[PDB]
């Protein structure tokens, strides 16, 4: 349909891809760092969701420079995707409100 609604899905399909690639690179980067906990895929994937939503529970986090890096890409894509739906939900509501004014 429209741009706003397209981007939303795109951000969704992109968020998932980033979640998957993120959890994978997360483990790749953290293993080798003594005391690191973000080192197995299943929980790394969970950590990923935790990060994209900024729900921060502090149960798992990167302790390496590259992990931190991977983390920043995930927070950004997370905050952006979720901020891209909010913006799409605003357009949807703005256009409908326009219709309810014979404008």
């Amino acid at each position, epitope marked *: 349909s429209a741009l706003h609604w397209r981007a939303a899905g795109a951000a969704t399909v992109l968020l998932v891809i980033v979640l998957l690639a993120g959890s*994978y690179l997360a483990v790749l980067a953290e293993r080798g760092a003594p005391g690191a*906990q973000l080192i197995t895929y299943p929980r790394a994937l969970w950590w990923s969701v935790e990060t994209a939503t900024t729900v921060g529970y502090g149960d798992l986090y990167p302790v390496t420079l590259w992990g931190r890096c991977v983390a920043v890409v995930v927070m950004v894509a997370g905050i952006t995707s979720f901020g891209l739906v909010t913006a799409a939900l605003a357009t949807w509501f703005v256009g409908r409100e326009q219709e309810r004014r014979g404008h």
Partner: antibody
Amino acid sequence: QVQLQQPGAELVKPGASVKLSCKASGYTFTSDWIHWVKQRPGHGLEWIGEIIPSYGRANYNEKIQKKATLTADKSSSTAFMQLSSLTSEDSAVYYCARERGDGYFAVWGAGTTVTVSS
Amino acid sequence: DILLTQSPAILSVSPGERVSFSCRASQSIGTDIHWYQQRTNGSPRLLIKYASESISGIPSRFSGSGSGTDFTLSINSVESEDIANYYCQQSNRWPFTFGSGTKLEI
């Protein structure tokens, strides 16, 4: 049906070196890590290192004298552990196992017993 | 690095009794503790993963319990086939580590 295959033995002279191999079969992934475990006679298991065949990255047990180098061959599905400048201390059975990136060693090789002497 | 302790080293028992091996982590590692069996001239064999979860192909007499820094592998009525060395391993933090292992004797 026998996932990891290692040569039963390898004789090495002091100061020498050896390249052990671990050929795998069965379900193969990109997440799969190949681990190496050293076991001296009358001793328990000791983690040596790990390698992610895909990316090809490897990590080593920073607690012990580094004597290994890990590599792999995406093609033949074979992981290699290069042991160099061995001594008496280096003689033991070296197992290789497969970890599905979830923390435990599902399958182990029969281990290659490396004895060092002239 | 995480230290895993297995006491006692050796462990006796009368045929058919219930036996429990202990593995104490030097710090809280959740349930990320796994168990291996190793017989004379054998390779380690996974018995229990993640403390409780049993493996396919493993006798039902083997069970594992625990969380945090204390875990125990039990055997309901040990048989002779059970005579071997048992090791614990963690995977909670890098690098993975192994217990000193415990030997069962009937």
